[PDB]
């Protein structure tokens, strides 16, 4: 709902699904320098389950108690029940925060990725680049 | 272990 | 949509959605808009692709060690299309042999349109193998990745005298450039037409020798790709902006009024093409009824596009009428021309506003595409680019995938979609037996959409 | 700060040539177009022409098109305008100015356009007399 | 094409004086108007760039305005340093050239 | 951009050792740099190659100067050094630090000559 | 070491063709590639011919290298005032580099 309402109103809008209605949400800006992304997206408390998006340590403003949330989209920090899924190995996910992209291979942090190495979809022009061919392997 | 975020304005 | 298996390119061909559609509504209702022909080129992001050769020898004891053939053996392969029957490091031979005889290279029929392969012993022990295959390098061309996934830190255009304008990062003792090197046209032919190549570069890998033909960058690589030509283009002039609109296009372009130097080197690979495209559009559409106004002007759009512009002005109504066929009559024709020009400017202003009306809709549909690409990225990217595209979801990015066509007659769909190995679970889509081309080992995948064959973890659900 | 320095007073004879120098400081010399402007004693500004320090491009009014030679030295970051065939009406104050228009973009070289002469030189008085 | 502006202006400290500049369908009609000061015996100085924007170090006395094919510079408070020549300039696309005005001499 | 600058002393006694050091900039002395060598040139006479050294320390000396010339490399500081021993008036020369950078070339990049007066 | 024999000076008028020789020996100049360097007084040498008869990018066509048995040659065609320099022939002899005596040229 947040992305759809943001597209409709052309402004950053956070919303939550509430059955047949949506609830508008208000966003509290955090420290912005305390955001630490965890390297291991595997749920240690339950084998066989893995996090959908990487876990973040962050701090609220003028505060010191470290909080544990989950990384969302558009630098949003998620709280509550963490999104989980089945550890479908092999895995290769890339999650973007700020001007940076994090590779997770088999639900473990691999490396940083330059954003310039990732092409952006252009709907107006729509010119495509051919990928690397495969050789029956 | 951790890795460190990067700021953005909007 | 042939039966095919589409696999992701090792995580390399990444793409992502970004909010790159920006809508700026033009304020003034000024109606003296210019008319002209336009051609639009986009910055070339696609990687330069070039053919390479990979020379190897194979030792089996199934451990299948791959090793680099000696450089003299490489010259034998390139000149005679033949390979020697031994490898030494102390010495090994084909099974139960000692001949060190020469062997004639023959095609491996298991090879594809990529990595076409040649072997000396067709045993699909010691073997000798030559693969000819693609390699990609993105700008700046300081390294290239071959289709077999090996990364080489050498510019595909380093010709041994331009390391200041190129890059070389591999081991110096293992790199050799050869002027006027003679290579055979086809390694699989007993006698083939030899061909001389100006500069051929070789690099001795650990398990391989990689060779490629060095070419001229400016002659083989072009940083601008032709997107589209608009014949009926209107342009509104602001104090520091030109705004281009086309009736057939849903996109409008915006640039500063300062022009690009058309005699710039970065336009060398697109200048003549664009000029001739403009000239063709004039000849076939405006040679009779219009006239060229000004020269060709090159503009750089705020979004990064490159625009070649030819202004056109319609001939006077007196000339148009004469082609279709006193002071007071001159005044009558002046009044007719004034009325015609006023109403035509009104029409052009209306058309420009109509063209601007598409931007909000395009931006919202872009957000719709971004949301839907998490569920089915292949279908969304295929709709956007209007071509069959396979993609995989990778968190905040999509990976482009390449599809291998299978036998097309070995596709057998299983009758029972119930998961026998786990009661209570059922397959989402039917299971398929299929065979790869020139192959016989039966493979088990799952039927997808548009005749695609899926591999990996089968999609399952509850038997409702 | 961004600054332009110009040569001192010069006195010549009708039929000579004057090479006025313009030294740039505080900014990249080849990144902005250079304007050359003239004012007669007790008269308004007259725009002589423009010069591209990045490519040597030059355009001048017909009164100066065939009589002005443009040279540059990027090491010194100094442009030179040589006015030949001096006449009695050529005695005036000459200014070199910096335009907000850049000589190149991030990818391509740019053509001349007028975005305002924000920085001006000190001026050079050229006197012509028999 | 030319740019026409009054040859001279006059006034008193604390008063307002206005300099007008006239163009054509080109130049001022479709382009920005740049205003340059010039104290006698000194080099010209950019007062106003674009239509009404103003650089650093220029007092708020000088307010620029644009309307159709005409421009104005209003000097409010007209102080003893404001007596100088004022030139308007614009890019003429028909000639592809920077055009200067005739110059207005504020005498205060 | 293979900047190459020498850091030798201008005046040296006709005894003990002349130490010269050459520093690389815009690049690094690595496994892709071929050889790095020293050349002398007595004032008004022809050039004379002294010695070459590689990134791994494998060095080659001229037959005449091998006993009186030592060469070393320091890839950590991107430098390499010549030591000339038992100096004589005939060792008075301009010393040029040079190297092979491109594949086809032999000595394409030269340093700035350090005049050593013995 | 086996220094390659090279004429101590050469000269010509402006616009004339000048030839500079380099004798050497069979083990030094006949086998390995021959390079020619142009050095102006007070400046580091500049590579003029890198292989036997190949010019680096930007070296004028006025300069041509050649080899005949052991004798290497440089020829300067349409000699110019800015060609007054020392030209050095250089090549390998036995895992070692050797320059020529250097022909000083006068226009
Ligand atoms: C099988 O027979 C072939 C010839 O019939 C043998 O090839 C020869 O192998 C030697 C090295 O073992 C090559 O010497 C090399 O020469 C190059 C210069 O050409 C040099 O750079 C190397 O350092 C090395 O000295 C020799 O040229 C080559 N003969 C050719 C190319 O005609 C091969 O050794 C035999 N193998 C066995 C296991 O008997
Ligand atoms: C190797 O590549 C360089 C460019 O990287 C070539 O240099 C160009 O050569 C052409 C033809 O002589 C000139 O027009 C260009 O101006 C040169 N450009 C540069 C940047 O040097 C060079 O010629 C190539 N060498 C070989 C042997 O093919
Ligand atoms: C656009 O670029 C070209 C070169 O690509 C410039 O042409 C140069 O013009 C100067 C002045 O006439 C000459 O001295 C040079 O020899 C020209 N170079 C070439 C390669 O022909 C041209 O002036 C540029 N235009 C502008 C407006 O800057
Ligand atoms: C924000 O985080 C930085 C870095 O840890 C810290 O120095 C600063 O005090 C924090 N600001 C708060 C808690 O208001
Ligand atoms: C390669 O062939 C061309 C054409 O014959 C020739 O000009 C060139 O010199 C040759 N290469 C070398 C290194 O001599
Ligand atoms: C169009 O016609 C002109 C002559 O009128 C010619 O120069 C130009 O090449 C033509 N363009 C084509 C045929 O594409
Ligand atoms: C168009 O090009 C011609 C030369 O082909 C030139 O004379 C003319 O001035 C150019 N157009 C304009 C508007 O300057
Ligand atoms: C494809 O399948 C058909 C039918 O089974 C078979 O006859 C043919 O040989 C196969 N082609 C291959 C494996 O290349």
């Amino acid at each position: 709902p947040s992305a759809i309402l943001s597209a409709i109103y052309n402004k950053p809008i956070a919303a939550r699904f509430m059955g047949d209605v949506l609830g508008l949400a208000s966003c509290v800006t955090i420290n912005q320098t305390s955001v630490k992304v965890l390297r291991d997206m595997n749920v240690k408390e339950s084998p066989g389950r893995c996090y959908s998006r990487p876990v973040v340590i962050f701090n609220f403003a003028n505060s010191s108690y470290v909080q544990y949330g989950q990384l969302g989209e558009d630098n949003e920090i998620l709280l509550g029940n963490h999104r989980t899924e089945e550890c479908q190995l092999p895995s290769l996910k890339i999650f973007i925060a700020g001007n940076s992209a994090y590779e997770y291979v088999d639900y473990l942090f691999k490396r940083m990725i330059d954003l310039s190495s990732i092409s952006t979809v252009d709907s107006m022009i729509a010119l495509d680049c051919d990928p690397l061919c495969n050789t029956d392997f | 272990g951790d890795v460190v975020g990067v700021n953005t304005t909007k | 949509y042939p039966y095919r298996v589409c696999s992701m390119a090792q995580g390399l061909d990444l793409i992502r959605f970004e909010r790159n559609i920006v809508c700026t509504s033009m304020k003034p209702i000024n109606e003296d808009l210019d008319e002209g022909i336009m051609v639009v080129y986009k910055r070339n992001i696609c990687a330069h692709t070039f053919k390479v050769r990979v020379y190897q020898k194979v030792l089996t004891f199934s451990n299948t060690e791959y090793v680099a053939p000696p450089m003299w053996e490489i010259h034998h392969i390139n000149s005679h299309s033949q390979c020697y029957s031994s490898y030494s490091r102390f010495v090994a031979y084909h099974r139960d042999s000692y001949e060190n005889k020469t062997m004639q290279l023959m095609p491996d029929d298991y090879s594809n349109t990529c990595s076409t392969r040649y072997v000396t012993v067709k045993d699909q022990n010691l073997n000798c193998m030559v693969t000819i295959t693609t390699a990609r390098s993105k700008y700046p061309y300081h390294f290239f990745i071959t289709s077999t996934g090996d990364v080489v830190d050498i510019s595909p255009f380093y010709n041994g005298t331009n390391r200041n304008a190129s890059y070389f990062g591999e081991n110096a003792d293992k790199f050799f450039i050869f002027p006027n090197y003679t290579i055979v046209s086809d390694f699989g032919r007993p006698n083939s037409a030899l061909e001389t190549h100006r500069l051929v570069a070789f690099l001795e890998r650990a398990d391989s020798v990689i060779s490629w033909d060095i070419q001229d960058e400016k002659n083989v690589t072009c940083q601008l790709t032709f997107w589209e030509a608009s014949e009926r283009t209107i342009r509104s002039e602001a104090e520091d902006s030109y705004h281009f609109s086309s009736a057939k296009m849903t996109a409008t372009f915006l640039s500063k009024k300062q022009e690009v130097n058309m005699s710039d080197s970065a336009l060398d690979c697109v200048r003549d093409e664009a000029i001739n495209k403009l000239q063709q559009i004039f000849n076939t559409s405006y040679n009779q009824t219009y006239e060229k106004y000004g020269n060709v002007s090159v503009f750089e759009t705020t979004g990064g596009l490159v625009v070649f512009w030819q202004g056109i002005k319609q001939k006077s109504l007196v000339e148009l009428e004469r082609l279709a066929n006193e002071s007071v009559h001159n005044l009558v024709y002046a009044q007719l021309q004034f009325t015609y020009d006023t109403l035509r400017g009104y029409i052009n202003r209306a058309l420009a506003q109509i063209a601007e009306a598409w931007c909000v809709d395009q931006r919202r549909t872009l957000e719709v595409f971004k949301e839907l690409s998490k569920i089915n990225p292949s279908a969304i990217l295929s709709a956007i680019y209007n071509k069959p595209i396979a993609a995989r979801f990778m968190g905040d990015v999509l990976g482009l995938a390449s599809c291998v066509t299978i036998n097309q007659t070995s596709v057998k769909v299983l009758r029972d979609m119930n998961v026998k190995e786990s009661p209570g679970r059922c397959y989402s889509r039917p299971v398929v037996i299929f065979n790869f081309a020139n192959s016989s080992y039966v493979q088990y995948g799952q039927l997808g959409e548009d005749n695609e064959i899926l591999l990996g973890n089968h999609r399952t659900e509850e038997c409702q | 700060q961004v600054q332009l320095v110009q040569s001192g007073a010069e006195v010549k004879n009708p039929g000579a040539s004057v090479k006025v120098s313009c030294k740039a400081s505080g900014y990249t010399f080849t990144d902005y177009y250079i304007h050359w402007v003239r004012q007669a004693p007790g008269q308004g500004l007259e725009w002589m022409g423009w010069f591209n320090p990045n490519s040597g491009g030059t355009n001048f009014v017909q009164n100066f098109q065939g009589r002005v030679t443009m040279t540059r030295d990027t090491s010194i970051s100094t442009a030179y305008m040589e006015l030949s065939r001096l006449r009695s009406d050529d005695t005036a104050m000459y200014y070199c100015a910096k335009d907000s228009a850049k000589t190149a973009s991030a990818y391509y070289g740019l053509n001349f356009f007028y975005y305002g002469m924000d920085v001006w030189g000190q001026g050079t008085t050229v006197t012509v007399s028999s | 094409s030319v740019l026409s502006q009054p040859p001279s202006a006059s006034g008193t400290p604390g008063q307002r004086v206005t300099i007008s500049c006239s163009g054509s369908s080109s130049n001022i009609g479709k382009n920005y108007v740049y205003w340059y000061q010039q104290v006698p015996g000194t080099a010209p100085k950019l007062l106003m760039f674009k239509n009404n924007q103003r650089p650093s170090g220029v007092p708020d006395r000088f307010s620029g305005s644009k309307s159709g094919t005409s421009a104005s510079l209003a000097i409010s408070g007209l102080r003893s340093e404001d007596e100088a020549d004022y030139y308007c300039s614009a890019w003429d696309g028909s000639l592809s050239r920077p055009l200067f005005g005739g110059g207005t001499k504020v005498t205060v | 951009q293979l900047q190459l600058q020498e850091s030798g002393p201008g005046l040296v006694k006709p005894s003990e050792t002349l130490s010269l050091t050459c520093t690389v900039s815009g690049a690094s002395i690595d496994r892709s740099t071929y050889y790095w060598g020293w050349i002398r040139q007595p004032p008004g006479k022809g050039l004379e190659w002294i010695a070459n050294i590689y990134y791994n320390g494998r060095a080659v000396y001229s037959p005449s100067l091998k006993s009186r010339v030592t060469i070393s490399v320091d890839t950590s500081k991107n430098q390499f050094s010549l030591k000339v021993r038992s100096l004589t008036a005939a060792d008075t020369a301009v010393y040029y630090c040079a190297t092979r950078w491109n594949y086809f070339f032999d000595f394409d990049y030269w340093g700035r000559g350090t005049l050593v007066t013995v």
Side-chain angles (χ1 to χ4, degrees), chain A residues 73 96 119 121 125 129 133, chain C residues 16 46 114 227 374 394 396:
Chain A
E73 297 186 307
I96 299 175
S119 302
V121 178
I125 273 62
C129 303
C133 46
Chain C
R16 71 184 174 89
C46 310
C114 277
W227 174 59
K374 303 179 181 291
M394 296 175 64
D396 294 353

Side-chain angles (χ1 to χ4, degrees), chain A residues 7-68:
Chain A
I8 291 171
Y9 294 101
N10 192 233
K11 57 172 61 185
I13 290 173
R16 303 298 179 241
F17 177 80
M18 296 174 64
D20 294 353
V21 312
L22 308 176
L24 297 166
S26 53
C27 306
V28 181
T29 305
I30 64 172
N31 182 296
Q32 302 218 76
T33 72
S34 65
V35 175
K36 302 297 176 66
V37 195
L38 273 67
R39 291 186 185 224
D40 189 7
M41 286 181 60
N42 203 295
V43 181
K44 306 177 180 183
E45 292 78 4
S46 175
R49 271 276 161 162
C50 283
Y51 293 114
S52 298
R53 301 191 64 85
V55 179
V56 162
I57 288 161
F58 67 102
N59 279 119
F60 287 109
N62 300 344
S63 307
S64 297
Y65 185 65
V66 287
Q67 325 281 354
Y68 282 69

Side-chain angles (χ1 to χ4, degrees), chain C residues 261 263, chain D residues 33 50 52 55-57 111:
Chain C
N261 192 351
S263 295
Chain D
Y33 277 91
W50 62 263
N52 188 348
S55 301
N111 270 346

Side-chain angles (χ1 to χ4, degrees), chain D:
Chain D
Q1 66 169 9
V2 180
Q3 183 169 320
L4 299 173
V5 182
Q6 218 175 315
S7 51
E10 184 66 291
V11 185
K12 295 292 187 182
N13 182 75
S17 305
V18 175
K19 185 180 293 180
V20 186
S21 70
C22 186
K23 167 65 171 60
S25 302
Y27 83 103
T28 308
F29 168 67
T30 53
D31 288 5
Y32 297 94
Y33 277 91
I34 302 300
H35 293 262
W36 292 83
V37 188
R38 187 174 75 164
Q39 60 176 16
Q43 196 164 4
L45 299 174
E46 170 177 42
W47 183 84
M48 301 178 65
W50 62 263
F51 168 71
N52 188 348
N54 200 6
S55 301
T58 299
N59 198 15
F60 268 74
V61 189
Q62 190 272 347
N63 189 69
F64 306 111
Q65 197 175 40
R67 297 168 51 246
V68 169
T69 299
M70 276 296 177
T71 63
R72 53 171 177 153
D73 195 327
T74 59
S75 69
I76 320 177
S77 305
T78 298
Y80 308 94
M81 171 204 80
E82 190 171 55
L83 182 60
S84 58
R85 271 66 60 75
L86 288 188
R87 305 191 304 248
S88 302
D89 61 309
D90 293 320
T91 169
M93 178 80 86
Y94 295 73
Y95 299 100
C96 62
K98 169 203 162 295
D99 200 308
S100 310
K102 295 186 178 182
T103 61
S105 61
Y107 301 109
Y108 318 106
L110 290 179
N111 270 346
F112 172 63
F113 194 85
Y114 179 54
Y115 289 120
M117 288 159 269
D118 56 354
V119 178
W120 291 71
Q122 66 177 230
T124 292
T125 55
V126 179
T127 300
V128 187
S129 61
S130 301

